[PDB]
Amino acid sequence: MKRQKRDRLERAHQRGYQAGIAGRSKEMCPYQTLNQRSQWLGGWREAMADRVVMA
Amino acid sequence: ESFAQLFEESLKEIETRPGSIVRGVVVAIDKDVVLVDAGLKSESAIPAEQFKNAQGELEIQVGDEVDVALDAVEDGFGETLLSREKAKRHEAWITLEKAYEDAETVTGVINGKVKGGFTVELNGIRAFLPGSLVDVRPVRDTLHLEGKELEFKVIKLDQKRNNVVVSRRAVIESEDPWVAIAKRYPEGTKLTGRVTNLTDYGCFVEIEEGVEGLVHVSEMDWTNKNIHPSKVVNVGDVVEVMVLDIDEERRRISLGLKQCKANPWQQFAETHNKGDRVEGKIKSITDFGIFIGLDGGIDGLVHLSDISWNVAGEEAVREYKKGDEIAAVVLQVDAERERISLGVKQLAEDP
Amino acid sequence: MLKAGVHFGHQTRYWNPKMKPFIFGARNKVHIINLEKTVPMFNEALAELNKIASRKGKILFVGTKRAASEAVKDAALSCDQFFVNHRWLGGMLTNWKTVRQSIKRLKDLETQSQDGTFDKLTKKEALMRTRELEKLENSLGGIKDMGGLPDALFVIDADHEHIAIKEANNLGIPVFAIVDTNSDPDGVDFVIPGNDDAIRAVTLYLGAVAATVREGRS
Amino acid sequence: IKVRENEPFDVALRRFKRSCEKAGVLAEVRRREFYEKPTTERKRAKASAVKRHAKKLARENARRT
Amino acid sequence: MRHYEIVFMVHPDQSEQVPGMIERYTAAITGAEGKIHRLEDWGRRQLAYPINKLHKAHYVLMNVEAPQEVIDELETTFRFNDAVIRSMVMRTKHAVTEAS
Amino acid sequence: FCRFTAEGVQEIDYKDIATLKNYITESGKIVPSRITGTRAKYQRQLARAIKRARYLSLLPYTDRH
RNA sequence: AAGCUUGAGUCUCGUAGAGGGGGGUAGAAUUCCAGGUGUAGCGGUGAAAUGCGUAGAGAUCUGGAGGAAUACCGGUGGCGAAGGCGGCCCCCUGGACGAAGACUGACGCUCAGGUGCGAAAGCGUGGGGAGCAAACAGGAUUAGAUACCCUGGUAGUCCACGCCGUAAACGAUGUCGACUUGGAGGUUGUGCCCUUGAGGCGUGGCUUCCGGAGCUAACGCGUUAAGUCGACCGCCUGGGGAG
RNA sequence: CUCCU
């Protein structure tokens, strides 16, 4: 029973990456703080390219 | 009566829209917010950074008077655009006098060309000029004592977009943006541009006579994704930017900003990358195959688990070094592409 | 007369059309409040303030506005009157029956923490009970000495504290406000068309009200 | 599309303009005549455009952060 | 009358018959009480795309004022000629002057 | 943005390809009025001029000819 | 009976428009055919197989034929009574709008019956047939799969002339007229002034969204009303049986 | 994927 994994910083990354790949071209389900919204959108734009490379 | 009507047209007569009439008296100072009252609706939330002169500290106490600017009214609550631009008009007037004077004499000191014209700075502000303007002939101020004192003799100004190249040393010597968009083009012409609004993907620096630039989020720094441009640069500030791309159709000049501390990283690869220089550096997070010392201005991932001692595989760096400690580590490889320096720690005295 | 503060006119385009009697569209697409009609309404307000304050009545001053915050405390503690300037609690007047014992918590807690057990339990307990006092202190501090329902409500922005106006129109309190151009002069009994967001204005209007109160107490 | 230039070239410019207009019109035209729902999808797209613009505009008040 | 803005392109290696062709065509228009307002020949220039495996055609601009039956017979004579590739007749309304 | 046809007093002729090539892209496609910022009337006159110049081969349809 | 001009209508200038009918033409692409190079796969799916290919496929190039639709512009843009109408050009033709005047003088509104127009599918006659595609075949999937998925594929989709006369034919809102706080836009004319600068102040038409009072059972409507009224018409009277 | 106020 221990402490949270990668304290929303690069968990905010992979939430934006999974949400980037599975459609959701909103870019309008992020966090609201800056240090987590910045890389929710960072994972989103890193997921658009990984959508172009596949189907 | 018509006292008030006359009073109204009087007060219309004794104000104007731009930052022209030095009228707002500074009626409260607190770091980091100045505030005036130029006879408008509310009081400006002034930054402190429109009012400190050339070395960082404030210059104006209570009662002091600078005009600001206008033509933008009510964003919810409040009144102005900043008085510092005010200042730009004064600079324009002096430049006009020189052009008007037939010449303008001040001091111009121009060390180097970001985009082909030495940079000249007058008083607080620094401006960029086209390459010829810095020197009257082929003299070149690179051999002159650094950041030398002359004046500026004007060589060239662009009259719409504000770029002015001025004449150092040699005292004796005396529709519209988009058709010919080939001036700042060719690959990397550096520009000095004020940023306007940072749209959480971008920064929107755009200065050169009615254009739009982005510098979006990917460059901006030497970290990619976690950056959030509001933290990293500014709001309303004239910066280092150059074109990197102009698209003729779609009208999207895509500028950049990483063309800076990229050089620092290169120096780190070199400076200490000449051979096998030793460095005193602090680890930040040990990730089961290394220790990740990251001292020396953003140089990223470093020492591997393979050296660490004179035993190869069994070591598990958390057992052997530390958390957050400055160590012996020397360079052993800088890879220019793919941004991997690979330091080591076995270079010590046990065998 | 724009006497000393500049209370000329406001915002741009999202005026409440009920304030058609107070408009002049300027060249900068900004309204000009009719300053030659403002002054009779302001004097009709002060003639009420001398009456209900010479009743020995209680005025409650309301304005937050992020800039008129300190002008209400400064320009209202000069009288013997009461103010709400930081946060307008929902139901301080029509639910004053349960705001009352929160005032009892404030007075009955600074009574315990000026001399009593402000150190006797825990440093963390001082960090709790003291933080409670600085949370209630700029929430109930001006209304603390009132102990009753007020007889008037002086609102500096109808558009910003419109729930204080409807609050004291559920019950029978004559509210009056200086309205902006976008504010709504419906619940306001004695409307004062002017400047809500100028520090000069919330010095001027509130200062002349402050003169009518303490000069009005005979 | 058409990229030819000197020795640093060949990838970024091309995947940019290629990727945008190519993947747009081919991923559109690859099936589904529809005859009826470009009307519905443009109507929903542009109603979402004005709702996003006004929604961010009146959402520019505060967020208590 | 009706105005027209005829631009017709010419097969390139038969372009020495073009001063004959202009004389025959404006002779045909002038034989029916019709004015003329332009004569601008742009010469042999480069086609943007190959028309019948062929580049570099010779363009003639006329921009005449003439009646409808004359302009119709003229357009049929642009059809039944292998020298003429892509004629074009255009709108009415107040014929004009030098263009390129 | 600015509408250059509104800055002139023009009515767009199909023969000044020096101006019309500022409004085709390098793939032959007509550039939108949200990019160039022309007025809608000169946008319609512009589109008819582009298509007419394509018919007289003063402009290309695509870049794969 | 005699007027009057505000309602209605006519004329002189323009203005924009996928409004309609007929004719012609252009480019890209799909398919096929002939030829060249070349050889072991292609195609397809959530995975597969049916299918095509050593008789030379798929790919690549050259040429030709034929049919259909008109990328970009493309715009909660435009025009039309509605259905609806998108390459470009010509011919014939309808309507709307505005500025300044002139002219007629209530010539107006609605309309049961009637007449006309009326998406798609379908039917008849004659052509045409690229692509797509009901029916149909086959392969899968499934416990079954007369289905969704795949491989093929005929009517039909296209044109000319007739018929049918229905649609969630929808704004689920009959037409015409008057009056009644605002804001942000789009489009289209026009007037004045410093067009001296994409400028400022008004003025008409059509249109999109948000909201005020008022209304509504609420949702929501809100000067283009579902607000306040007037004229005329159509329609409703519990659900099923039953259009 | 990055063209706003």
Curated annotation (Swiss-Prot), chain A:
Pfam families: RMF. InterPro entries: Ribosome_modulation_factor, RMF_sf. Induction: Induced during stationary growth phase. Requires ppGpp for translation. The keyword rRNA-binding applies. GO terms for molecular function: ribosomal small subunit binding; ribosome binding; rRNA binding. It is found in: Cytoplasm. Keywords: Cytoplasm, RNA-binding, rRNA-binding, Stress response, Translation regulation. GO terms for cellular component: cytoplasm. GO terms for biological process: cellular response to stress; dormancy process; negative regulation of translation in response to stress. Disruption phenotype: Non-essential gene, 100S ribosome dimers are not formed, decreased cell viability during stationary phase. A quadruple raiA-hpf-rmf-sra knockout strain is significantly outcompeted by wild-type after 4 days growth. Very high sensitivity to aminoglycoside antiobiotic gentamicin in stationary phase cultures. Belongs to the ribosome modulation factor family. NCBIfam families: PRK14563.1 (NF011162), Rmf_CrpP_fam (NF041886). Associates exclusively with 100S ribosomes. Contacts 16S rRNA, might contact ribosomal protein S18. When cells are transferred to rich nutritious culture medium, RMF is quickly released from 100S ribosomes, which dissociate into 70S ribosomes. It indicates that this interconversion is a major system regulating translation activity during the transition of growth phases. This is Ribosome modulation factor. It comes from Escherichia coli (strain K12). The gene is rmf.
From Swiss-Prot, chain B:
GO terms for cellular component: cytoplasm; cytosolic small ribosomal subunit; membrane. Residues 19-85, 103-169, 188-258, 275-345 form the S1 motif domain. The keyword Acetylation applies. One of its GO terms (biological process) is cytoplasmic translation. Phosphorylated; probably on a serine. RNA binds at R137, R140. Induction: Represses its own translation via the N-terminus (at protein level). Keywords: Acetylation, Chaperone, Cytoplasm, Phosphoprotein, Repeat, Repressor, Ribonucleoprotein, Ribosomal protein, RNA-binding. Part of the 30S ribosomal subunit; the largest protein subunit, it is loosely associated and not always found in ribosomal crystal structures. Does not bind rRNA. Probably requires ribosomal protein uS2 to associate with the 30S subunit. Binds in the junction of the head, platform and main body of the 30S subunit; the N-terminus penetrates the 30S subunit while the C-terminus faces ribosomal protein uS2. Nascent polypeptide chains cross-link this protein in situ. Can be cross-linked to mRNA in the ribosome. (Microbial infection) During infection by bacteriophage Qbeta, part of the viral RNA-dependent RNA polymerase complex, the other subunits are the viral replicase catalytic subunit (AC P14647), host EF-Tu and EF-Ts. Belongs to the bacterial ribosomal protein bS1 family. This is Small ribosomal subunit protein bS1. The chain holds residues 3 to 440 of 557 of the full protein.
Curated annotation (Swiss-Prot), chain E:
5 different forms of the protein, varying only in the number of C-terminal glutamate residues, were isolated. The sequence shown is form bS6-6, which is the longest. The first two Glu are encoded by the rpsF gene, the other Glu are added post-translationally by the RimK enzyme. It comes from the Bacteria. Keywords: Acetylation, Ribonucleoprotein, Ribosomal protein, RNA-binding, rRNA-binding. One of its GO terms (molecular function) is mRNA 5'-UTR binding. The modification N6-acetyllysine is found at K93. The keyword Chaperone does not apply. GO terms for biological process: cytoplasmic translation. Binds together with bS18 to 16S ribosomal RNA. Part of the 30S ribosomal subunit. Interacts weakly with uL2 in one of the 3.5 A resolved structures. This is Small ribosomal subunit protein bS6. It comes from Escherichia coli (strain K12). The gene is rpsF.
Curated annotation (Swiss-Prot), chain F:
One of its GO terms (biological process) is cytoplasmic translation. It comes from the Bacteria. One of its GO terms (molecular function) is small ribosomal subunit rRNA binding. Disulfide bonds: none annotated. The keyword Transport does not apply. InterPro entries: Ribosomal_bS18, Ribosomal_bS18_CS, Ribosomal_bS18_sf. Pfam families: Ribosomal_S18. GO terms for cellular component: cytoplasm; cytosol; cytosolic small ribosomal subunit. Keywords: Acetylation, Ribonucleoprotein, Ribosomal protein, RNA-binding, rRNA-binding. Gene3D superfamilies: Ribosomal protein S18 (4.10.640.10). NCBIfam families: S18. Belongs to the bacterial ribosomal protein bS18 family. Binds as a heterodimer with protein bS6 to the central domain of the 16S rRNA, where it helps stabilize the platform of the 30S subunit. Part of the 30S ribosomal subunit. Forms a tight heterodimer with protein bS6. This is Small ribosomal subunit protein bS18. It comes from Escherichia coli (strain K12).
